[PDB]
Amino acid sequence: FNGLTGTGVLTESNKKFLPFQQFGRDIADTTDAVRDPQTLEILDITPCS
Amino acid sequence: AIGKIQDSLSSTASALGKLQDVVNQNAQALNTLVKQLSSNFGAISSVL
Ligand SMILES: *[C@@H]1O[C@H](CO)[C@@H](O)[C@H](O)[C@H]1NC(C)=O
Secondary structure, eight states: TOOOOOOOEEEEEEOOTTTTOOOETTTTTTTEEEEESSSSOEEEEEEOO | OHHHHHHHHOOOOTTTTTHHHHHHHHHHHHHHHGGGGGGOSSSSOOOO
């Protein structure tokens, strides 16, 4: 996503990103959730099992 | 005496502080270990 490389599972979520917010971060600044740059929708990033 | 111990355990939350401190210390160690991934350590970024 816009050069942010990672491995995980993209699922539909309910985390209301603010309109100026593009990336979400965890405690250890791992990418928790992203907004898709094409369609303005919200997705979690859960790393694979 | 058994009833008094029951009332004391129901009323005082600091009676089991000897176990609560162990659980809290484990939580602090785990949280510190997680949060140490956010440090740059002199590099350009903390994200691999
Ligand atoms: C990507 O394409 C959709 C139409 O499929 C369009 O609505 C959207 O605005 C485009 N993304 C950007 C950033 O313009």
